[PDB]
Amino acid sequence: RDAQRMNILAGRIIAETVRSTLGPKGMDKMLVDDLGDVVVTNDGVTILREMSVEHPAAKMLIEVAKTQEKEVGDGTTTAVVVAGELLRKAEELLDQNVHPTIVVKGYQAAAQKAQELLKTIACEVGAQDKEILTKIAMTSITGKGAEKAKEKLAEIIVEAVSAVVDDEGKVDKDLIKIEKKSGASIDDTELIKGVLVDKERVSAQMPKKVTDAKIALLNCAIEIKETETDAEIRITDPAKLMEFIEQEEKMLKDMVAEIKASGANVLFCQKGIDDLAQHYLAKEGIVAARRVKKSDMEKLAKATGANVITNIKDLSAQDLGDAGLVEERKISGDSMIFVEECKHPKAVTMLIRGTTEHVIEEVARAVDDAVGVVGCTIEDGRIVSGGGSTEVELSMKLREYAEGISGREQLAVRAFADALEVIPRTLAENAGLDAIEILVKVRAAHASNGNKCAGLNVFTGAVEDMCENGVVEPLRVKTQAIQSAAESTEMLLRIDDVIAAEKLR
């Protein structure tokens, strides 16, 4: 009869399976499909992909997460666990002779009112504030897994975001890139100036150790070019193999000589080069390369002061490039240079170092996400104290402001406040502590003149400072969750154009 009563119970099942999987520490479930591949992933959208749905009333709970996942791509699960709580509370009031129109009207009023109260509590952060910028490093590195030396790693990684700041004070994630190679320790990486090349050689032959060498950035190749008109090549003389090999050397000796005579010394070709042509570069001491990634000519435009020219035959003095500090260093075998740009942000390559292929890759899974949570704070230049602090702070104010709202809509504004305090509750159950006797103590700090920089620590299990400890998340990761949640949860109550039994199309 009610029909919808069968759908309200579906949001709790999909939310319960991803309820205890919050916070850094937490088990990961697995939905073994008909294939057999057993995989586990703590991320939110990952587990939702490889999974089958039964009732078609669940295609509107994940769709709202895709909009936020494409932007911040972090903390999207927090917006789903909060919907299941306020959903169960709606059932407790629906049977009390309350129409759904009165419940949907309260969430819209509480959601819009929370914006005015959030901006006041939202702290301020400057792009140039070096003292405050370092506080964001410990907040990001600790939200993943690297406590073995967070005090040292957080000091060298802050130098990148601190130096790759633009005049306007913003920063993008595409300007940062990470790699992985063999080495000793992560401290081997150094920041000076320049952009690193991605691709490498294919055959070992050319010299690989020449300190101070002029670089030439061009795109061309030395091969028999064919005219635009349709033509072909015919050969009927097997006795013509050891002839052009000597004549072709004259065209390459004087041509390649212009590269060294002009001033340049290193060149990144676009296509493979003959083997014999490479043996001469070793004895003469000339360095060269080939098969360079296309996404490297524009990066080295101003990073070193070079010029991008098409053809290589006409490499005059004006068509010469430039390099920063070509200091060759043996990288546990192959000597290369790790030039890193910072003065002019364009594409820094803070590669990873380590004496283990399995460890250098593990750090990449974390450092790649640190620039995102740390870079977004510099863009908008605003941050709100997290860790269950902003949740208990607003709940105490909505109760006092709700006294003035006279009408039947005062039941939703009060029940909605109990759904915002679920963030510290899930973290308490993970540690194995009673989530009832501890909530009364959290409100003691944020009673009257409680500092907004306070919250709760899951490790020690007691109220501590947020900014000092480093528990402050951006403002867009929490405002978009509550704003998108209030707009998506109300869709289930609204019905008018449902896909009832009226043909598939």
Q: Are strands 382-385 and 472-474 parallel, antiparallel or unpaired?
A: antiparallel
Cα 270 to Cα 130, 203, 255, 347: the distances in Å are: 42, 15, 17, 21
Tell me the DSSP string of 75-110.
S-THHHHHHHHHHHHHHHHHTTT--HHHHHHHHHHH
Looking at 43, 188, 322, 465, which residue is catalytic? 43
Report which of 309, 310, 344, 308 is spatially closest to residue 324, judged by C-alpha positions: 344
Q: How many CB atoms lie within 10 A of CB 255?
A: 13
With tokens 């502590």, the residue in question is: 433
E strands, 104-165, where?
123-124
Helix (H, G, I), strand (E, B) or coil at 497: coil
CA distance 115 to 17: 30
Question: What residues are paired with 454 via a beta bridge?
Answer: 465
The tokens describing 352, both together, are 């990873």
The tokens describing 164, both together, are 């790759």
CA distance 277 to 308: 24
Catalytic annotation present for 77: yes
The tokens describing 500, both together, are 């009832």
Q: Residue 156 contacts by C-beta under 8 Å, 6 or more apart in sequence? A: 186, 187, 189
Longest dimension (CA), the chain: 104
Question: What residues are paired with 331 via a beta bridge?
Answer: 334
Q: Residue 42 contacts by C-beta under 8 Å, 6 or more apart in sequence? A: 21, 26, 28
CA distance 216 to 307: 8
CA distance 494 to 96: 19
CA 169 to chain CA mean position, Å: 19
Question: What angle in degrees, to the nearest 10, is found between the helix axes of 130-141 and 357-380?
Answer: 130
CA distance 102 to 200: 65
Question: What angle in degrees, to the nearest 10, is found between the helix axes of 357-380 and 150-163?
Answer: 50
CA distance 86 to 412: 9
Sign of CA dihedral 472, 476, 477, 479: positive
CATH of the domain at 258: 3.50.7.10
Looking at 76, 78, 349, 390, which residue is catalytic? 76
Buried b (16+ CB within 10 A) or exposed e, 193-231: ebbbbeeeeeeeebbeeeeebbbbbbbbebeeeeeeeee
Residue 167, H or E segment: none
Looking at 21, 77, 390, 479, which residue is catalytic? 77
Q: Are 104 and 490 in contact (CB under 8 A)?
A: yes
3-state secondary structure 416-473: HHHHHCHHHHHHHHHHCCCCCCCHHHHHHHCCCCCCCCECCCCCCCCCCECCCCCCEE
- In the DSSP assignment, the letter for residue 43 is S
Tell me the DSSP string of 322-352.
--S----EEETTEEE------SS-S-EE--B
3-state secondary structure 251-297: HHHHHHHHHHHHCCCEEECCCCCCHHHHHHHHHHCCCCECCCCHHHC
Model resolution, angstroms: 6.3
With tokens 């109260």, the residue in question is: 117
CA distance 426 to 237: 83
The tokens describing 261, both together, are 């005579």
Residue 149, H or E segment: none
Looking at 296, 322, 369, 465, which residue is catalytic? 369
Report which of 294, 292, 290 is spatially closest to residue 273, judged by C-alpha positions: 290
With tokens 């006279």, the residue in question is: 406
Backbone angles phi, psi at 348, to 5 degrees: -75, 145
Q: How many CB atoms lie within 10 A of CB 248?
A: 15
Cα 500 to Cα 56, 91, 293, 447, 495: the distances in Å are: 11, 24, 54, 51, 11
Q: How many CB atoms lie within 10 A of CB 53?
A: 12
Catalytic annotation present for 369: yes
Helix (H, G, I), strand (E, B) or coil at 176: strand
Q: Residue 159 contacts by C-beta under 8 Å, 6 or more apart in sequence? A: 191, 342
Q: Are strands 382-385 and 348-349 parallel, antiparallel or unpaired?
A: unpaired
CA distance 136 to 377: 9
Q: How far apart are the first and last CA of the chain?
A: 25
Q: Are 133 and 141 in contact (CB under 8 A)?
A: no
Buried b (16+ CB within 10 A) or exposed e, 63-99: ebbeebbeebbbbbbbbbbbbbbbbebbeebbeeebe
Cα 169 to Cα 136, 207, 402: the distances in Å are: 16, 42, 40
Report which of 78, 72, 82 is spatially closest to residue 107, judged by C-alpha positions: 82
Q: What is the dihedral of CA 217, 218, 219, 221, to 10 degrees?
A: -110
CA distance 59 to 43: 19
The tokens describing 15, both together, are 């939310």
Q: Are 302 and 151 in contact (CB under 8 A)?
A: no
Residue 384, H or E segment: strand 382-385
CA distance 331 to 324: 19
Question: What residues are paired with 329 via a beta bridge?
Answer: 336
Backbone angles phi, psi at 344, to 5 degrees: -115, 100
Report which of 460, 466, 459 is spatially closest to residue 392, judged by C-alpha positions: 466
Helix and strand totals (H; E) in the chain? 17, 9
Residue type, 151: E
Q: Residue 260 contacts by C-beta under 8 Å, 6 or more apart in sequence? A: 284, 286
Q: Residue 310 contacts by C-beta under 8 Å, 6 or more apart in sequence? A: 218, 219, 220
Sign of CA dihedral 309, 314, 320, 321: positive
CB-facing half-sphere around the CA of 79: CA atoms within 13 A: 30
CA distance 161 to 137: 10
CA distance 501 to 505: 11
- In the DSSP assignment, the letter for residue 312 is S
CB-facing half-sphere around the CA of 381: CA atoms within 13 A: 8
Experimental method of this PDB entry? cryo-EM
Q: How many CB atoms lie within 10 A of CB 108?
A: 14
Report which of 439, 467, 469 is spatially closest to residue 453, judged by C-alpha positions: 467
Q: Residue 471 contacts by C-beta under 8 Å, 6 or more apart in sequence? A: 139, 385, 386, 387, 389, 455, 457
CA distance 154 to 277: 47
Tell me the DSSP string of 191-242.
--S----S---SSS-S----SS--EE-B----S-PPPSS--------SS-ST
Domain span at 272: 209-350
CA distance 415 to 88: 10
Helix (H, G, I), strand (E, B) or coil at 401: helix
CB-facing half-sphere around the CA of 446: CA atoms within 13 A: 24
Q: How many CB atoms lie within 10 A of CB 410?
A: 15
